[PDB]
């Protein structure tokens, strides 16, 4: 369960957590996809005091009512506007530049019933591309999953790999007139011919999905789609 | 008032070239910085390089700024691109008495394409390891101002190109994917060559 991936139903809420230590003013920021990063509001814990930009209603974002905790950032009564990488972020003590944490990515969607999973599937490597290049790309397949909060990562012989691989950098929309589309992301891992020739070597593909918690009731018929890791794998062979 | 205006949406530049990155701004401040970030896909924005108002063009390894006070211009080059330049870069002001808010633009995504010195452009099928009848097709080994044409089908999905760095071997490659759910689907024509 990562914090940096929220998926709420429209109404809810959220607390986003700020990963950088507070002494000075901690400053929130909202990156919309498309749109500038813009500051909606900043806290002193030590002052116990908020300052909001303007345009926002003073009931949207909540800092108090934590039993006995620094100041929060809980937004209230969440519309699929509030979509969002948050960030948090502080001016550095030499005030030479503003830090920046982690984002926290937030999805607020209409029902949570438009949460699904991904299939995963390997395919492995042509035998022409084998008998030309002496190489042998094999590609992951995750599909029919949302929202788009995954970390496709390949395993080689029980081991995370980090060469010979390229993700999509963006999923693409499966329905993408949709709006609440499921998603599709596909991935290559390329190795030696004779790598990939020996049946001892195991390759395998897997996806963490950031889904639903334990919290979540949602109301559907098939498997709670919580967040999991989905794998498929493919052994080498020599013919 | 403060503005910030990133004109360009995104720019491709070859592995060891150089990019430039506009940045437009309006600001009734006396003295003031413009910062520029890097934001990547695991969503992080890390500071690269900051441009005072009453400061030499500002130079951080491979950064570089060129400030035109009175054009209101403060363009980042970076220099000798390698892949791990692609990201999103946003430039940002900030008023410096009273460090407070920064004022960002749209971000101008850059994409580092590898120089493929030897191309192979080619077309496989890829059976599916547990299904076999389920399949997917690869386009490999083309060179970078290849332009991977579009899906003009609803039912068959073409992703964007990426490169891997087979990096054992000094071998980069780029590849695309296409994928359909139909029996009438032909790796050749999928691609549109």
């Known amino acids: 369960g990562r914090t940096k991936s929220v998926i709420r139903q429209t109404g809810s809420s959220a607390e986003i957590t700020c990963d950088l230590a507070?002494?000075?003013?901690i400053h929130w920021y909202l990156h919309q996809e498309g749109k500038a990063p813009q500051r909606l509001l900043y806290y002193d814990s030590y002052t116990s005091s908020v300052v909001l930009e303007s345009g926002i209603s003073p009931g949207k974002y909540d800092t108090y009512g934590s039993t006995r905790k620094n100041l929060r950032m809980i937004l209230r009564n969440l519309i699929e506007n509030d979509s969002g990488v948050y960030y948090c972020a502080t001016w550095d003590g030499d005030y030479y530049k503003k830090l920046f944490g982690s984002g926290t990515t937030l999805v607020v969607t209409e029902d949570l019933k438009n949460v699904f999973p991904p299939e995963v599937a390997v395919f492995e490597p042509s035998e022409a591309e084998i008998s030309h290049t002496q190489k042998a790309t094999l590609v992951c397949l995750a599909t029919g999953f949302y929202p788009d909060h995954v970390e496709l990562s390949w395993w080689v012989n029980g081991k995370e790999v980090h060469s010979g691989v390229c993700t999509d950098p963006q999923p693409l929309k499966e329905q993408p007139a949709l709006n609440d589309s499921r998603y599709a992301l596909s991935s290559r891992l390329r190795v030696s011919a004779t790598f990939w020739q020996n049946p001892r070597n195991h390759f395998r593909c897997q996806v963490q999905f950031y889904g639903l918690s334990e919290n979540d009731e949602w109301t559907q018929d098939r498997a709670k789609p919580v967040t999991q890791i989905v794998s498929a794998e493919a052994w080498g062979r020599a013919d | 008032a403060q503005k910030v205006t990133q004109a360009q949406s995104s720019v491709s530049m070859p592995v060891r070239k150089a990019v430039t990155l506009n940045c437009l701004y309006e600001?009734?401040?006396?003295?003031?910085?413009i910062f520029w970030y890097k934001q990547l896909p695991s969503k992080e924005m890390i500071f690269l390089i900051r441009q005072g108002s009453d400061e030499q063009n500002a130079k951080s390894g491979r950064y570089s700024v060129n400030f035109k006070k009175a054009a209101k211009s403060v363009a980042l080059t970076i220099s000798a691109l390698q892949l791990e330049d692609s990201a999103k870069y946003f430039c940002?002001?900030?008023?410096?008495?009273?460090?407070?808010?920064?004022?960002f633009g749209k971000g101008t995504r850059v994409t580092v394409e590898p120089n493929i010195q030897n191309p192979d452009p080619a077309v496989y099928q890829l059976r599916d390891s547990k299904s076999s009848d389920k399949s997917v097709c690869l386009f490999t080994d083309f060179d970078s101002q290849t332009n991977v044409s579009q899906s003009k089908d609803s039912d068959v999905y073409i992703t964007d190109k990426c490169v891997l760095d087979m990096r054992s071997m000094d071998f980069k490659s780029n590849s695309a994917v296409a994928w359909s759910n139909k029996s009438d689907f032909a790796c050749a024509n999928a691609f549109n060559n």
């Open positions: 600001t009734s401040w006396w003295s003031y910085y």
């Open positions: 940002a002001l900030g008023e410096l008495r009273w460090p407070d808010k920064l004022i």
């Open positions: 507070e002494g000075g003013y």
